[PDB]
Design a binder for these strands. Structure first.
Ligand SMILES: [Mg+2]
Ligand SMILES: [Mg+2]
Ligand SMILES: [Mg+2]
Ligand SMILES: [Mg+2]
Ligand SMILES: [Mg+2]
Ligand SMILES: [Mg+2]
Ligand SMILES: [Mg+2]
Ligand SMILES: [Mg+2]
Ligand SMILES: [Mg+2]
Ligand SMILES: [Mg+2]
Ligand SMILES: [Mg+2]
Ligand SMILES: [Mg+2]
Ligand SMILES: [Mg+2]
Ligand SMILES: [Mg+2]
Ligand SMILES: [Mg+2]
Ligand SMILES: [Mg+2]
Ligand SMILES: [Mg+2]
Ligand SMILES: [Mg+2]
Ligand SMILES: [Mg+2]
Ligand SMILES: [Mg+2]
Ligand SMILES: [Mg+2]
Ligand SMILES: [Mg+2]
Ligand SMILES: [Mg+2]
Ligand SMILES: [Mg+2]
Ligand SMILES: [Mg+2]
Ligand SMILES: [Mg+2]
Ligand SMILES: [Mg+2]
Ligand SMILES: [Mg+2]
Ligand SMILES: [Mg+2]
Ligand SMILES: [Mg+2]
Ligand SMILES: [Mg+2]
Ligand SMILES: [Mg+2]
Ligand SMILES: [Mg+2]
Ligand SMILES: [Mg+2]
Ligand SMILES: [Mg+2]
Ligand SMILES: [Mg+2]
Ligand SMILES: [Mg+2]
Ligand SMILES: [Mg+2]
Ligand SMILES: [Mg+2]
Length: 354
RNA sequence: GAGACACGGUCCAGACUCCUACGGGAGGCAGCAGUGGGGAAUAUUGCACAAUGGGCGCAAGCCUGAUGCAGCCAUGCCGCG
RNA sequence: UACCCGCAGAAGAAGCACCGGCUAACUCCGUGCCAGCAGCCGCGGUAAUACGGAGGGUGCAAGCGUUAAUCGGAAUUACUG
RNA sequence: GUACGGCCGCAAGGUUAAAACUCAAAUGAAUUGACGGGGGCCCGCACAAGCGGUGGAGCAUGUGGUUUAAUUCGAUGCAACGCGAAGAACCUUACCUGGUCUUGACAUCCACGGAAGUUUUCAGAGAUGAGAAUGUGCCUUCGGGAACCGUGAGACAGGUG
RNA sequence: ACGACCAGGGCUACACACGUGCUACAAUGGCGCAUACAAAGAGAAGCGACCUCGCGAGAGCAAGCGGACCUCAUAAAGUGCGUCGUAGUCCGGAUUGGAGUCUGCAACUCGACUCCAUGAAGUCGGAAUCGCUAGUAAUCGUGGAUCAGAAUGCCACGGUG
RNA sequence: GCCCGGAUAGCUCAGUCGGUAGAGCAGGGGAUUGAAAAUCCCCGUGUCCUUGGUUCGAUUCCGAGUCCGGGCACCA
RNA sequence: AUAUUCUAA
RNA sequence: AGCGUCGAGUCGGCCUGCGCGGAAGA
RNA sequence: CGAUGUCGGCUCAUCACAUCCUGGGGCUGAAGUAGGUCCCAAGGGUAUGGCUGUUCGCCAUUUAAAGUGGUACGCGAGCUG
């Protein structure tokens, strides 16, 4: 975390090379993706320099006078300066806190039973409750589209839309395996069992606007229809082939004797086929996106472990362990989320162009 | 030819490599060393005919990558630090 | 060249595998069904003689392990049996 | 005992008969149990025979849940739920909010300075802080202490974590 | 500071679900008046008589008793006589208003008790389910621990049966 | 494009033809069970597709749409 | 006459 | 208008007449 | 309606220009090469196959280019069927 904020000072000075000189002013293109990079990590740098002024003072705060007598009375002045540097860390949060429009949008919280059968399902229930209680705290509107209840309680699957301002900015990190280690409720011998649940947090995609079939994006071919119908069918351009140039979808229609009916029928079909083909892409995109977020339901594939015996939650990607499980299960998730958002932004502002 | 259907002979055909004045020619490391390649992996383009053997010779000798030796490698066995 | 004699000075010369059982050799720290180990049985899910390091120990030693391959153990193709 | 091939068959199929791959077992008999909607024999308000309740009402009380700054922690089939608690207004109290302390509310150890106690005032929600009178006893080699209070250490105390 | 001190809050929250109790729905009863018959137990910062005052909870004054002595302390169901006459009642006593009492630095959150007023649900409880074999069940009072105060709980005690 | 039928509880369906809607399965609460089913008791559930009329009053009777299903779009 | 089921340390 | 200089007209609306473009086929 | 033979192919065409190529230009978000777009221009030129009765279309491979239309969607007293 501190090592990352050091890497900002590494990419703070090399950029701060040209102000009113002649090197990168030749092309405004490359300069545009450089001057704007400075601005983002400039606010964080100056605030970090203020924190890098207080640390070293602690190694000369123990004894400033020399003899131990007034040192403790003098330390109270440096103790107040330590409380000020604590507020600089409280600011650090706000300077990292993300400002990307994608974070503000709403989110579909999908929770599925991993390995553990009924026990997994009971813990899906405990996770969904934990998110629900976290969603109603900060005051979001959580509502259930699809539930599949387990035999002994909980859910085999629970899909809930969580609606507010900044949902997908705080729940994006819940995606993946959640491993639970406890004596289940479905357990006769008092044995500890290790179940997992998969959580997918997918952001709300702007519904799906079925667009108008622009006639300038059509090639319409008229020609003689095939088969029976005497002189009329010999001589009449009844048959329609509408080729949609964008997609490349082509629909032929010669079911009726009138070109107008055929053309009408073909536009209808070409509509249906264009609108079915794009809704297929969306399903595939969603299916693949979900597949990746979930991972396997196996106990080995996890971002977080909830060990009830020890009352330990341990996020595995930010090697963090808290003995505050009872709190976390009641939906005080800002013990776990905050750090993850810090270390995510620490990387974003460190690696943008590189 | 005593002996071969002949490793470093002949003829034909074939594929491959090379030379060519384009007409035509040349060649065969499964000797020793060595090169490329293949491979988990296997050595020096030494020295000498002094010894033992072989060819020819009356013999002296000449030839002998057989052989005797050296080089390389903990590859093994044995011995010693 | 083998071998012999002289000179100086401990001087120039120790590693490799293993230590849960089978199997000779045990403890501490770290990790927390992860990372990893593993010939078989198995070990590891916050008090690990089994993982990784350390200290100690055992076995081999200019080798030591691993892998491959063969017979053995296998009376598990049995002639012996 | 399957595939492929062969032979047989009207067919159904039979017959002959592999391999890959996979597991560290699979298996036989017997032993101790446990279990059976197996058998036999017994017992207990276990049923039956009775009597009175609970489940509905209002209230008490505990719990789950929900709520909350906090609703402290524990008990959870029988064998948790008027249970730990034989008694939460303060105290208790472990919880929350705010105000405070840092060898420290509670111990031992050392140095320094003071007898304790006694009344009284102000500020403060109180903790606490700042004053002012008021004593300077008890053991005594009248050198020293030990009755307990302050102040400074750093060994540690402290923790219903 | 996950240690320590303090004030004030909270453990008493309330769409709801369950357990354990209490009180009822009445006439084998209610109310009024009169009147019998227990056991067991507690008591010194304690139990507190008598007398006086108060509708009452209580208050004042104060004996006695570390108790087979004094106090708590009137047992109640029962019995006799009266009334009510089957009504949501002269059943039931929730809830709420007003006015008090006492404990306690302090009863707002959050005490118990008293008085006047108020007079809810409830007319014997669906599926179900509990206890009990005799001085038992059922029903009737009585005491104690904890405790300043604060039992319908608990632990004891007799009565009727 | 036209035509016939349909739109009623969460799902599948009755019903009514002017007033005052049901069923089964879901759902909720209780019970039974060591627990989950099955079972048992108690409950709730609808703007009667959307509009614009007629009417004192429309789920019901008109006239539009919308969605669904079933025809048909022919003679040549 | 009717009695199904019990994952995974 | 042209570039303060230069020395008579000048500017763009209205009413209306006739024309111009817009105007490619076997 | 006392008959004006109807698709496509074949053969043979002929005209228009709203130009596919070649010729001449303006503008270009025209550096060059190559394009875009609009104007002028009808002299000449303007695929062969696979599939399908096909017209159309898709596909293969060409070409400077494989124009768009009219002609009883030209052409059965010319062929096919
Ligand atoms: Mg030869
Ligand atoms: Mg050769
Ligand atoms: Mg060679
Ligand atoms: Mg190689
Ligand atoms: Mg030679
Ligand atoms: Mg051993
Ligand atoms: Mg082997
Ligand atoms: Mg053998
Ligand atoms: Mg067979
Ligand atoms: Mg066969
Ligand atoms: Mg019975
Ligand atoms: Mg009740
Ligand atoms: Mg609790
Ligand atoms: Mg608990
Ligand atoms: Mg505990
Ligand atoms: Mg416990
Ligand atoms: Mg309190
Ligand atoms: Mg505090
Ligand atoms: Mg307090
Ligand atoms: Mg409580
Ligand atoms: Mg009454
Ligand atoms: Mg007492
Ligand atoms: Mg009533
Ligand atoms: Mg009655
Ligand atoms: Mg008995
Ligand atoms: Mg009683
Ligand atoms: Mg008491
Ligand atoms: Mg009794
Ligand atoms: Mg099943
Ligand atoms: Mg004109
Ligand atoms: Mg005629
Ligand atoms: Mg032209
Ligand atoms: Mg011409
Ligand atoms: Mg000319
Ligand atoms: Mg073609
Ligand atoms: Mg034509
Ligand atoms: Mg024609
Ligand atoms: Mg023809
Ligand atoms: Mg003709």
């Amino acid at each position: 975390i501190v090592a990352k904020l050091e890497a900002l000072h590494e990419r703070h000075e090399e950029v701060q090379a040209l102000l009113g000189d002649a090197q990168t002013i030749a092309d405004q293109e490359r300069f545009r993706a450089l001057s704007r990079e400075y601005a983002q990590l400039s606010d964080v740098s100056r605030c970090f320099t203020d924190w890098q002024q207080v640390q070293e003072d602690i190694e000369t705060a123990q004894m400033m006078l020399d003899d131990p007598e007034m040192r403790e009375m003098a330390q109270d002045e440096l103790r107040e300066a330590k409380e000020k540097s604590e507020q600089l860390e409280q600011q650090l949060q706000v300077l990292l806190l993300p400002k990307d429009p994608d974070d503000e949008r709403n989110a579909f919280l999908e929770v599925r039973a991993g390995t553990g059968g009924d026990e997994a399902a009971l813990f899906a229930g405990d996770l969904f409750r934990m998110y629900s209680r976290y969603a109603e705290a900060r005051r979001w509107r959580v509502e259930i589209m699809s539930a599949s209840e387990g035999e002994h309680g909980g859910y085999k699957e629970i899909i809930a839309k969580i609606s507010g301002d900044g949902v997908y900015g705080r729940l994006k990190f819940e995606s993946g395996g959640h491993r639970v280690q406890r004596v289940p409720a479905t357990e006769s011998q008092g044995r500890i069992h290790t179940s997992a649940c998969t959580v997918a947090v997918m952001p709300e995609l702007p519904d799906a606007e079925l667009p108008d079939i622009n006639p300038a994006d059509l090639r319409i071919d008229t020609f003689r229809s095939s088969g029976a119908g005497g002189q009329h069918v010999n001589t009449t351009d009844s048959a329609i082939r509408i080729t949609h140039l964008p997609t490349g979808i082509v629909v032929e229609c010669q079911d009726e004797r009138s070109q107008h009916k055929n053309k009408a029928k073909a536009l209808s079909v070409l509509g249906a086929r264009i609108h079915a083909a794009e809704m297929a892409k969306r399903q595939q995109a969603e299916a693949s996106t979900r597949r990746n977020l979930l991972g396997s339901g196996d106990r080995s594939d996890r971002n977080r472990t909830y060990n009830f015996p020890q009352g330990r939650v341990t996020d595995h990607r930010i090697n963090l362990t808290l003995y505050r499980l009872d709190e976390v299960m009641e939906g005080k998730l800002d013990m776990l989320i905050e750090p993850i958002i810090q270390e995510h932004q620490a990387d974003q502002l460190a690696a943008l162009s590189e």
